[PDB]
């Protein structure tokens, strides 16, 4: 498509251009991630990423674990979802949420030294910082569930969460997260791999996160 060239990176997701060849609409359909399958071997893995069956050819970390269809037990039980969200990182151990599907209960049962992944995961959430921080437990739990690893906000020099307003003239929220793989040992070695997975979920219409995201990064 020739029309797709002008539509590239126009901050509008054009389904017509939502393909690997068109660069996922120049990141418009993949949360600004140029190529989530940057290092994946076999192509058409993105075509099999949206199913539930285990496709061993796309199971590699480079091929984004085939949306964890081979690892699994796959999703946190919807019946227990609200409980796990409310009891995430509350100081008290809730064993029923202590699984990779339900974000390991905010490491309440693993109180084990931290094994942080390389870098800082940066999310531009289309919510004001005040609204976001009120729903912090739910935000973290659901992200810690989708990424199958523990996630917490990066802290200031004073010890406060790194949640800042996005674009001061108007408004948007910049959320800086850290990935903890202490209960991991598949899993994410850095922030950019997790960013590519979130970007890949967007592209194949499989991202189930109730918080509207603008983009996803990986900075050191």
């Amino acid at each position, epitope marked *: 498509r020739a029309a797709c060239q002008a539509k590239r990176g*126009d901050q*509008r997701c*054009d389904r017509e251009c939502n393909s690997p060849g068109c660069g996922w609409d120049g990141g418009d359909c993949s949360l600004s991630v140029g190529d989530p399958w940057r290092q994946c071997e076999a192509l058409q893995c993105w075509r099999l990423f949206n199913n539930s069956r285990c496709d061993p050819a796309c199971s590699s970390p480079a091929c984004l674990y085939d949306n964890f269809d081979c690892h699994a037990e796959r999703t946190c039980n919807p019946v227990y979802e609200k409980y796990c969200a409310d009891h995430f990182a509350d100081g008290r151990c809730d064993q029923g949420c202590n699984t990779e599907e339900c974000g390991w209960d905010g490491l309440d049962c693993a109180s084990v030294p931290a094994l942080l992944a390389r870098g800082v995961l940066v999310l531009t959430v*289309l919510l004001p910082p005040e609204e976001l921080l009120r729903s912090s437990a739910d935000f973290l739990q659901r992200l810690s569930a989708i990424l199958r690893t523990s996630l917490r906000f990066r802290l200031d020099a004073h010890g406060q969460a790194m949640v800042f307003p996005y674009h001061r003239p*108007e408004v948007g929220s910049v959320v800086m997260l850290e990935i903890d793989n202490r209960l991991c040992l598949h899993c994410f070695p850095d922030a950019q791999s997790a960013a590519d997975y979130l970007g890949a979920l967007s592209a194949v219409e499989r*991202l*189930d*996160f109730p918080y*509207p*995201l603008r983009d996803v990064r990986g900075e050191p």
Partner: antibody
Amino acid sequence: EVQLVESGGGLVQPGGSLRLSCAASGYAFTDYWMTWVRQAPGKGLEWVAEISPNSGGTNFNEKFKGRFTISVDNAKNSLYLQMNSLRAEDTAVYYCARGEIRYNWFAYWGQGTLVTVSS
Amino acid sequence: DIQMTQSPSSLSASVGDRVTITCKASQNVGNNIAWYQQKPGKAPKLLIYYASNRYTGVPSRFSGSGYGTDFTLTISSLQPEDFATYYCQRLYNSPFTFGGGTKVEIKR
């Protein structure tokens, strides 16, 4: 504060043409997509088209491709809807709305302008 | 073209009642849905954006739920001002198709 004021509209002969104006203020015009929504008397809301003030890019509803035109003037922070070959069915209140980043939900809307297609 | 079917088309409830409005999409849209409130002769007002997020200033009684195709707008305790027409909207992808509309009338 964010403000959208739509000008134009009133009476137009069947088969005729009419241009509508939407004057934006209180925000960076180049940062958000602009939309046109119409509502027939008694009927529900209908999305017409959108325009990118930053790229000049357009997206349309198939039902309005060809006979309707969308345009911008960045200097005047304005958006325009040109309507040709107007039928009685085009009689509606035309609203201009600001599109929120990436998902296009509308928090800010214009007051609306009535367009009546009659001989 | 992905269709947006609202149910019911019209509803009549008393003040204090729990009102439930549904919007069903022909194909999967995920969390790409918004809810609007339109009062007679006035521009629509945004209530819920991205399936469940309540817009600033919207009272706590308004709630949004769902993922995929079946979405629900809930008014916990109906109020006399809540008399209006409610519309769902498909987000992210063009065309940004609005639902049929759901007129809420009040028993007095």
